[PDB]
C-alpha cells in the first residue's frame, strides 16, 4: 500500500502490482531512471508554467471562448493540440464560438450526455450543472502549453489532497489568477442551498482549476457556477476524456 503511503515516493502516477508498486508519468514525460524521478520529455511538455493577473506565459494553457456578439463568454483549458476542455453550460448559449492575456475555428464539440442544464434541472427535479463538462476540438492543430491530465487515483489521493489550487479565472481587461483552498465535502454540501453532486467540488466559468505538484501542473477541475466556488470534479471524468482523446 506504498503508493497510498506518500505516493510510493513517486513524482507522478503511482499504481499497483500484486506485491509491487508501479510508477508512471504524465503525458510528454520521461520516467525516472530511478523508477520514480520522472522528468520533462520535451520542450512542449504539459504542466510547465514558468519555472492577480496571470502573467502571459504563466497560464500557457488557459483558453478563451470568443463570441462574435458577446466576445469572451467562457474560458477553457488546452488539453492537446486538437482538443480543449470546457464547461457544458458554456456551449450553445452564444451565437458563435472560437497565448494572450490582453483582453481559431472550433470544429467539433463533445457535450457530456448526462449534463443537466438549469432549465433541464427544472424539468426533472435534477442536480443543476451536474456533469458540467465538455470537450472542444479545433479545426487546425494549435502550435505550442497544455495542462497535464492526471489519473483518478492520483487526483483523488495526491492532487486534490493539497492546501490550495490555482483558478486562473479572468470582467477585467487582463487575465486573473488566484489560489483556492480545498474545502470539505460536507462543509461544501452544508454551505450551499444548491445540492452539489458527487461529480462536483468547491474551493470565468470554463476556466482551468489545476493542482500543482513537483513544479508541475495537473488539471483537477473546471469552473462551474457560483459561499464557495463550485468545480467539476475531473476525477470522475478521466476515462470519459481519454475516450474522446483516444479518438482517432
Amino acid at each position: 500500500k506504498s503508493c497510498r503511503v506518500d505516493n510510493g515516493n513517486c513524482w507522478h502516477f503511482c499504481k499497483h502490482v500484486q506485491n509491487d508498486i508501479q510508477c508512471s508519468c504524465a503525458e510528454g514525460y520521461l520516467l525516472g531512471e530511478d523508477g520514480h524521478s520522472c522528468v520533462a520529455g520535451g520542450n512542449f511538455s504539459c504542466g510547465r508554467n514558468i519555472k492577480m493577473d496571470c502573467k502571459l506565459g504563466e497560464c500557457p494553457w488557459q483558453a478563451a471562448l470568443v463570441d462574435e456578439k458577446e466576445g469572451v463568454f467562457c474560458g477553457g483549458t488546452i488539453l492537446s493540440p486538437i482538443y480543449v476542455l470546457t464547461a457544458a453550460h458554456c456551449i450553445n448559449e452564444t451565437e458563435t464560438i472560437s497565448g494572450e492575456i490582453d483582453k481559431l475555428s472550433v470544429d467539433k464539440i463533445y457535450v457530456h450526455k448526462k449534463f443537466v442544464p438549469p432549465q433541464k434541472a427544472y424539468k426533472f427535479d435534477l442536480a443543476a450543472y451536474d456533469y458540467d463538462i465538455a470537450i472542444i476540438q479545433m479545426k487546425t492543430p494549435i502550435q505550442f502549453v497544455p495542462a497535464c491530465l492526471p489519473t483518478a487515483d492520483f487526483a483523488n489521493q495526491v492532487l486534490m489532497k493539497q492546501d490550495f489550487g490555482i483558478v486562473s479565472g479572468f470582467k477585467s481587461k487582463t487575465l486573473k489568477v488566484l489560489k483556492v483552498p480545498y474545502v470539505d465535502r460536507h462543509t461544501c454540501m452544508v454551505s450551499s442551498e444548491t445540492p452539489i453532486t458527487p461529480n462536483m467540488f468547491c474551493a470565468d466559468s470554463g476556466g482551468p482549476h489545476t493542482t500543482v505538484y513537483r513544479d508541475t501542473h495537473f488539471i483537477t477541475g473546471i469552473v462551474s457556477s457560483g459561499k464557495y466556488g463550485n468545480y467539476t470534479k475531473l476525477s470522475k471524468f478521466i476515462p470519459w476524456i481519454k475516450r474522446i482523446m483516444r479518438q482517432k
Partner: protein, 1262 residues
C-alpha cells in the same frame, strides 16, 4: 451578591416507597432557624434533601446538625469550597480545624461556608443555573443508599429573584432518578428500590405545569453501582444544552440541565425507557393544564402503515464468519429451541388506504425488520393512517414530536380509548405537527434521529417486533430525499426478547421439538429467545453495505429493544462526526438516537460492531465496502480491445513530518498494592530498533501507570511503530482515530484483503511488524480552540481480554507546531488518565469476577506525579475502555474544568463512557492535595481514586541557604578537600573559604545532601564556585537525587543533567518544571574546572505554601493582643510581652518573665482564626548575659474553646522543639499538620540566662 443561610440536618425517618412496610432512613432536611420548627419542604422532594441555590458572588452557609446514628457530612460536586468545607476525608495533611468538616458524629454540628466563585459559574454556553448533587461523603455507598442526598444549583449572576426562583423559566423542577439498595443502608434490609426522588412504584407526586409554559429541568441520576438512565417526557421534547432531544442520557452520579417548552394539554408519563426501569414501575406524570396564557416549503406529509403478523428470520444467509457457539446458542434450532425465525408483528407501508398494494416488493433491503422510515421538517404536518392487521390491538407512537393527547398514541395505566390503541382490522389516523420547539438546533445535524412504536405495552409490543426509525429535519432534506448528504443510513441496535412477545407460545407451539415439555423461563431456553439484532439481523451476513469513496454518508443510530447497558459502537479507518466532533466510537443510551456523518475518507472493506457480551459481538455487527469505481474497463479495453459508446452530444456550428517509535509487548508482574500481585503483558518503548535497551522513565511518566508510552504526533505527520511481540500469546497494535490502511489495522474479520494485508492482524511471540499510521486533519484537533486530540491503542487479537491483561496505551495529536526541543508539549501541563476496572478473570494470564481492581492506570489509589501549579493551564486526557458496565463519572475535587473545544461549557463532573476519550482543560483555583475520582460508589471506594496536588504559583522563593534559616547542621557532603565545608555551601558567601569543594578520583562521584528536615517543594537550583583570583574552581555540570525517606531516593529527569557555572562567581539558575517534593535533596557534580567547587541555594515553597509573616515583626499584630504570663518590670527597665518581635534591636529588645519557670508562657491573640505553619524564635542581648530559649513547647486553641498542646504525629506527647543557640539567631520551626487556632502559646522548657525571645508567626488567612 448575597449571604444565603440554610439550616440543614440529618435524621432518621420511616420512609415508604409507596404512600397511596416502611424503612428507616437517614436523610437531610431543612430545619428552620435555630432548628425551631423544621420547614414546609415540598412533597415532591421525597427523600431528596433540600435543594440549595446561590448565584455567582453569593455565599452559602449550612448549619448542619447530625441527628443520625452515624457520622454524616455535606459535600458538593461543585468546587465552591475549601478543605474546611470539603466534607470529605482523605490524606490531605491539614489541621484538625480542616478535618472538622470531614465527618460529624451524632449530636455534633458544623458551619459550612461556601464561596460560589465566578470561576465555577455557568457562564457562556451554559443555562442560567447548572445542576449538581451533594451528599454524605463519609461512606457515600452506605450513606447515600440510606437517603442522605440532595441537589445543589450553581446558578449564574442575575438569574434569580428574591423568591430565589429562576426568572428565565416559568417553572423549575428537580428530578433525581435514583436506585436505592436498603441492603446497604446501615439499617440493612434485603430490598432494592427504583425510585424518582424516593417515590417507587410510580407514586411520585403529580408535577404541575400550565399549558404553553417554559420549564427548566434539573435531572439527577444516581446510585451506588454503575447505573444508566434515559429519562423521557411523553409528547414533549427538551434541549439538553443547545441540542434538541426527547431522551435524556443521565448516568449514576451525573446531573442534567434542560429547558422544555410544553404545548399540549393533558397528563403525560415520565419514565426511563429502559427495560428494567420500566418494569420496576419507576414513573411519574407531567400534569399540564391550560391556564388562558397565550402560546412556505411546508408540505403536510401522509403515510399509510399497517401492523402485519409475519414470520421473521433474524438468520438469513448466515455466513461462516459468525461464532459457532452462537448459531448453536441462539440460531440453530437444535435442542428443542425455536431456532432462527419466530412470529413477528412488524410495520409495513402502503400507497393507499385500501391497504392492498404495499409500497415495496421485498421487505426493504437493509432495514431488516425495521418498519417504514418516517420523516418531516419543521412546521410540516405529517398524517399517519394506522391499520392493525395483527391478532391483538396495537398503536403508533413517535418521539421528538409534541403530539397531542388526541393523537398521542400511548396507553397509560390509568385508563379503561382515543386512537391510543387501535384494534385488529381497525383503522386510525394520527395527525400531529412538527412545532418550532421540536425543531433541532444549529448544533444538531441536518436531521435529528428518533423512533416510533406501539404504546399498548411498549416493551412487550417492541419485543414482538414493532419498531421504526423517524427523522426530524430542519428545512434541508428536500423532496422527500436527504440533503447535504449522499447516503441516508440506519443502524438500529434492537434487542428483541421473544419471551416478552405476544407470540411467545405461537412460536413454541410451532417451531419447537416437543412444546409439551417446553419450559419457558428455563435459563438456557430463555436466553435463547432473547436475541440481539442490528436492523433485525441477529448476525453478520454474506452481503456487505457498500459505499463510495470521498462521499459523506449520514447515519442514524438508535439502540431500541430491552437494552439494559449502554450499547457502544465501532467503525474502522472511518470515524463518526457527532456533535461537531470526531469519535471512532459511539455509546448509545437506550431509546435516544444519535445522528453522525461518517465520511468515506478511507477505502477498503471494514467492520462495524458493538463490543461487549459474547452476544453483542455477533448479534450486532456488519461489514461495509469503501472503494472507487475503477479502472477503467473502457480505456484498457480500447487499448487491448473493444471500445464502446462515447456518451457525448456533438456540435460545432458557428460562422507533514515523520515520527517513529520502537514499542514491544513485554511480560510483567503487577500487584495493585505496593494476592494483589499478578502477571501481565504490558508495552514499553525502546531506544531504537535494536531493542534490549528499553527507554528509561521520566518524571512526568511517573503517573502514566500501566499505560504504554505516549504515541504523540501532529496532523499530516506519519507514524512508524516498529512493534514486536515478546510474550506467551500473539498480540497486535490497533490505533484509534488515526488513518491506518488494512496493513496497519490489527484485526481479523471478513476483510476481503489478501494475506498481504492480514499479516498485521496478529503477531505471535517474537513476531515483528511495522505499523505506518497516518494523521489526517480529521484525526487531530478540530478548530483552533482545541489543542490536542486524544486516541487510544490496544490489542487487536482480542481487544477486551487483551486490554484487561495489561495491554493499553495513549495517543496524542497536538496542533501542528506544539511540541518542543525534546518530545514534550510546551506552555501546558499534561496528564493521561485511564479509568478502567481491570478484571484478572478476563486477562489471558490466569487459572462465547472476584479479582477486580477498580483502579486508574492500573494503580488503584496510589499513582503520583500529579503536581500542578495554581492557575497554570493543565490538560487531562481521559481514556476509558471497559464494557457497558464501567461508566466513570470523573471528578476533580475543589476544581472546575471545561472540556476542550467547548470552552463555553462548564460542567465539573464528566461521565466518561466506554470507549471514550476527551481532553479537558484545568487551571486549578485551590492549593494543596486533592482527590480525583469517580462519583461511582462501588469503584470510588474500591481503588479508582488517585490524589493530586497543586502549588502556589509563586513557588520559587529563596528557601534558606543564603539566610541560613537552614541549620549548618543540615548540610552534609560525601567528602571535602581542604577547609571547604558543606556547612559553608551558601550563595554569595564570602571568606577565604566560602564553599564546599572536594577532590575527584577514579573512585566514586561526590555529592552534597541538603536536608530540609521536612518534605517541601523545590522548583530551581543555583550554582557557583569561589574565586581565589587566578583560577575559580567551579562546577560545570551536575544532577539531582531527592528522597523523602532518608536513604532510598530517585533521580530527577524532566532533566538528567544540569548546566554548571561559567566561572567562580556567576550565578547560574536552573528550573524544574515537574516540581520535586521530598525531605532530602542531593547535588552530584559531573563536570568542573579545577575541582567541584559548590555553594548553592534552593528555590521552592512549602507543600501548602502558606508560610507568610503574620505581622509580629511587621507590627500588623497590635501589642494589645500580645498577652503574657508575666513581664519582668524592674524599677529601671521591664520587658513587656508586646516587645517580643523578630529582628528587633532598640531599647529592651524582647520579652522576659519576672518569674522564670516551666509555668511561663507567651500568648499571642489573633482575634480571628488564622492558619499557622511555621514560627521563628529569637533571643536578647543586654548587660548580664544574652538570653534565649533552649527548648520549648506550643499550646493552641481548639474547635470548642479549650487549650490543647501541639501533640506530635511522630510521638506520644506534644513535640518539644530546639530553641536558639545564641541571641541574634533565628530557628524556624514548622508544624507537621498546620495549626488552625486563634491563640498560640509558647511554653519554654529550657532557656539560657533569663527567658527572652522574639517571635515571628507564619501563616495564611484561611
Amino acid at each position: 451578591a448575597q449571604l444565603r443561610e440554610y439550616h440543614i440536618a440529618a435524621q432518621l425517618e420511616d420512609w415508604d416507597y409507596n404512600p397511596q412496610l416502611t424503612f428507616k432512613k437517614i436523610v437531610y432536611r431543612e430545619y428552620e432557624l435555630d432548628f425551631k420548627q423544621e420547614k414546609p419542604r415540598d412533597a415532591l422532594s421525597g427523600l431528596l434533601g433540600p435543594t440549595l441555590r446561590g448565584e455567582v458572588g453569593d455565599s452559602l452557609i449550612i448549619y448542619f446538625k447530625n441527628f443520625a446514628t452515624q457520622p454524616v457530612s455535606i459535600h458538593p460536586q461543585s468546587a465552591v469550597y475549601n478543605k474546611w468545607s470539603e466534607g470529605s476525608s482523605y490524606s490531605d495533611g491539614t489541621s484538625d480545624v480542616e478535618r472538622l468538616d470531614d465527618a460529624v458524629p451524632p449530636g455534633q454540628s458544623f458551619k459550612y461556608v461556601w464561596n460560589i466563585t465566578a470561576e465555577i459559574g455557568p457562564k457562556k454556553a451554559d443555562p442560567p443555573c447548572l445542576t449538581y448533587a451533594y451528599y454524605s461523603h463519609v461512606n457515600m455507598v452506605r450513606d447515600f443508599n440510606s437517603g442522605l442526598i440532595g441537589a445543589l444549583l450553581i446558578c449564574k449572576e442575575g438569574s434569580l429573584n428574591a423568591n430565589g426562583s429562576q426568572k428565565f423559566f416559568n417553572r423549575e423542577y428537580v428530578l433525581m432518578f435514583s436506585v436505592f439498595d436498603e441492603s446497604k443502608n446501615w439499617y440493612r434490609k434485603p430490598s432494592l428500590q427504583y425510585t424518582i426522588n424516593g417515590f417507587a412504584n410510580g407514586t411520585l407526586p403529580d408535577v404541575q405545569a400550565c399549558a404553553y409554559d417554559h420549564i427548566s429541568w434539573h435531572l439527577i441520576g444516581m446510585s451506588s453501582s454503575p447505573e444508566i438512565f434515559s429519562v423521557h417526557f411523553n409528547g414533549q421534547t427538551l434541549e439538553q444544552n443547545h441540542y434538541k432531544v426527547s431522551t435524556i442520557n443521565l448516568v449514576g452520579g451525573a446531573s442534567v440541565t434542560a429547558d422544555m417548552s410544553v404545548s399540549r394539554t393533558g397528563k403525560w408519563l415520565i419514565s426511563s425507557l429502559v427495560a428494567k426501569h420500566l418494569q420496576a414501575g419507576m414513573y411519574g406524570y407531567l400534569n399540564i393544564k391550560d391556564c388562558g396564557n397565550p402560546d412556505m416549503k411546508i408540505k403536510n406529509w401522509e403515510y399509510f402503515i399497517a401492523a402485519e403478523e409475519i414470520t421473521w428470520d433474524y438468520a438469513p444467509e448466515i455466513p461462516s464468519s459468525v461464532d459457532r457457539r452462537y448459531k448453536a446458542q441462539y440460531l440453530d434450532n437444535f435442542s428443542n429451541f425455536i431456532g432462527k425465525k419466530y412470529k413477528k408483528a412488524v410495520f409495513r407501508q402502503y400507497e393507499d388506504g385500501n391497504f392492498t398494494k404495499p409500497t415495496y416488493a421485498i421487505w426493504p433491503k437493509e432495514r431488516g425488520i425495521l418498519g417504514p422510515v418516517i420523516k418531516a421538517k419543521v412546521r410540516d404536518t405529517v398524517t399517519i393512517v394506522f391499520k392493525n392487521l395483527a391478532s391483538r390491538p396495537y398503536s403508533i407512537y413517535v418521539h421528538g414530536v409534541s403530539v397531542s393527547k388526541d393523537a398521542e398514541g400511548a396507553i397509560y395505566p390509568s385508563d379503561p380509548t382515543h386512537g391510543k390503541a387501535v384494534e385488529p382490522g381497525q383503522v386510525y389516523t394520527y395527525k400531529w405537527t412538527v412545532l418550532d420547539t421540536d425543531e433541532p438546533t444549529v448544533k444538531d445535524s441536518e436531521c435529528i434521529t428518533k423512533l416510533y412504536h406501539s404504546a399498548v405495552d411498549m416493551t412487550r409490543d417492541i419485543a414482538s417486533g414493532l419498531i421504526g426509525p423517524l427523522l426530524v429535519c430542519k428545512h434541508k432534506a428536500l423532496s422527500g430525499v436527504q440533503n447535504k448528504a449522499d447516503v441516508e443510513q440506519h443502524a438500529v441496535f434492537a434487542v428483541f426478547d421473544e419471551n416478552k412477545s405476544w407470540y411467545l407460545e405461537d412460536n413454541i407451539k410451532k417451531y419447537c421439538s416437543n412444546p409439551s415439555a417446553v419450559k419457558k423461563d428455563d435459563p438456557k431456553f430463555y436466553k435463547s429467545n432473547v436475541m440481539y439484532t442490528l436492523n433485525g439481523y441477529a448476525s453478520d451476513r454474506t452481503e456487505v453495505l457498500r459505499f463510495h469513496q470521498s462521499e459523506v454518508v449520514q447515519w442514524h443510530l438508535t439502540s431500541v429493544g430491552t437494552v439494559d447497558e449502554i450499547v457502544p459502537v465501532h467503525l474502522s479507518g472511518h470515524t463518526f462526526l457527532s456533535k461537531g466532533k470526531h469519535q471512532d466510537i459511539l455509546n448509545l443510551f437506550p431509546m435516544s438516537g444519535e445522528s453522525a456523518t461518517v465520511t468515506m475518507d478511507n477505502l477498503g472493506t471494514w467492520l462495524l460492531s458493538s463490543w461487549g457480551s459474547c452476544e453483542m459481538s455477533n448479534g450486532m455487527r456488519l461489514r461495509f465496502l469503501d472503494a472507487n469505481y475503477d479502472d477503467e474497463d473502457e480505456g484498457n479495453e480500447e487499448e487491448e480491445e473493444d471500445d464502446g459508446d462515447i456518451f457525448a452530444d456533438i456540435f460545432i456550428p458557428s460562422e507533514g513530518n515523520k515520527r517513529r517509535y520502537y514499542i514491544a509487548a513485554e511480560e510483567v508482574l503487577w500487584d495493585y498494592s505496593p494476592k494483589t500481585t499478578f502477571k501481565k503483558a504490558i508495552f514499553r518503548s525502546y531506544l531504537d530498533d535494536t531493542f534490549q535497551t528499553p527507554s528509561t522513565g521520566g518524571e512526568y511518566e511517573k503517573h502514566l501507570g500501566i499505560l504504554g508510552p505516549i504515541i504523540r504526533a501532529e496532523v499530516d505527520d506519519v507514524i512508524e511503530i516498529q512493534f514486536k511481540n515478546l510474550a506467551s500469546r500473539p498480540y497486535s497494535l490497533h490505533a484509534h482515530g488515526l488513518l491506518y490502511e488494512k496493513s496497519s489495522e490489527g484485526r481479523s474479520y471478513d476483510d476481503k484483503s489478501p494475506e498481504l494485508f492480514k499479516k498485521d492482524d496478529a503477531i505471535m511471540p517474537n513476531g515483528t511488524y511495522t505499523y505506518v499510521w497516518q494523521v489526517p486533519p480529521r484525526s487531530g484537533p478540530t478548530d483552533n480552540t482545541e489543542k490536542c486530540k486524544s486516541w487510544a491503542y490496544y490489542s487487536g487479537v482480542n481487544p477486551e481480554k487483551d486490554i484487561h491483561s495489561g495491554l493499553i496505551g495513549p495517543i496524542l495529536i497536538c496542533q501542528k507546531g506544539m511540541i518542543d526541543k525534546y518530545n514534550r508539549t510546551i506552555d501546558i501541563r499534561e496528564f493521561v488518565l485511564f479509568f478502567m476496572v481491570f478484571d484478572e478473570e478476563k486477562s489471558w494470564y490466569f487459572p462465547c469476577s472476584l479479582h477486580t481492581f477498580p483502579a486508574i492506570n492500573g494503580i488503584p489509589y496510589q499513582l503520583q506525579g500529579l503536581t500542578m501549579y495554581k492557575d497554570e493551564n493543565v490538560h487531562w486526557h481521559l481514556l476509558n475502555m471497559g464494557g457497558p458496565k464501567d461508566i466513570h463519572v470523573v471528578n476533580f475535587h475543589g476544581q472546575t474544568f471545561t472540556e476542550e473545544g467547548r470552552e463555553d461549557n462548564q460542567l465539573g463532573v464528566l461521565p466518561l463512557l466506554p470507549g471514550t476519550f476527551a481532553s479537558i482543560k484545568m487551571k486549578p483555583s485551590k492549593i494543596g492535595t486533592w482527590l480525583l475520582e469517580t462519583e461511582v460508589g462501588e469503584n470510588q471506594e474500591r481503588g479508582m481514586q488517585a490524589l493530586f496536588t497543586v502549588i502556589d504559583k509563586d513557588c520559587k522563593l529563596p528557601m534558606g541557604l543564603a539566610s541560613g534559616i537552614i541549620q549548618d547542621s543540615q548540610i552534609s557532603a560525601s567528602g571535602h578537600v581542604g577547609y571547604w565545608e558543606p556547612k559553608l555551601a551558601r550563595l554569595n558567601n564570602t571568606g577565604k573559604y566560602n564553599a564546599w569543594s572536594i577532590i575527584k578520583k577514579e573512585h566514586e562521584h561526590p555529592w552534597i545532601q541538603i536536608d530540609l528536615q521536612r518534605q517541601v517543594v523545590i522548583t530551581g537550583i543555583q550554582t557557583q564556585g569561589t574565586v581565589q583570583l587566578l583560577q575559580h574552581s567551579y562546577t560545570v555540570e551536575y544532577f539531582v537525587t531527592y528522597s523523602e525517606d532518608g536513604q532510598n531516593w530517585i533521580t530527577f529527569k524532566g532533566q538528567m543533567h544540569f548546566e554548571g557555572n561559567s566561572d567562580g562567581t556567576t550565578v547560574k539558575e536552573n528550573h524544574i518544571d515537574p516540581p520535586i517534593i521530598a525531605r532530602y535533596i542531593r547535588l552530584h557534580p559531573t563536570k568542573f574546572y579545577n575541582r567541584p567547587t559548590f555553594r548553592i541555594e534552593l528555590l521552592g515553597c512549602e507543600v501548602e505554601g502558606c508560610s507568610v509573616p503574620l505581622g509580629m515583626e511587621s507590627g500588623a499584630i497590635k501589642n494589645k493582643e500580645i498577652t503574657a504570663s508575666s513581664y519582668k518590670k524592674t524599677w529601671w527597665s521591664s520587658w513587656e510581652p508586646f516587645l517580643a518581635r523578630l529582628n528587633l534591636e532598640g531599647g529592651t529588645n524582647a520579652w522576659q518573665p519576672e518569674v522564670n519557670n516551666k509555668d511561663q508562657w507567651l500568648q499571642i491573640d489573633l482575634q480571628h482564626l488564622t492558619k499557622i505553619t511555621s514560627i521563628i524564635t529569637q533571643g536578647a542581648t543586654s548587660m548580664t548575659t544574652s538570653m534565649y530559649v533552649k527548648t520549648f513547647s506550643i499550646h493552641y486553641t481548639d474547635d470548642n474553646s479549650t487549650w490543647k498542646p501541639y501533640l506530635d504525629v511522630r510521638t506520644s506527647m506534644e513535640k518539644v522543639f530546639t530553641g536558639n543557640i545564641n541571641s541574634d539567631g533565628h530557628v524556624k520551626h514548622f508544624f507537621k499538620p498546620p495549626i488552625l487556632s486563634r491563640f498560640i502559646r509558647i511554653i519554654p522548657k529550657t532557656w539560657n540566662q533569663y527567658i527572652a525571645l522574639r517571635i515571628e508567626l507564619f501563616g495564611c488567612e484561611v
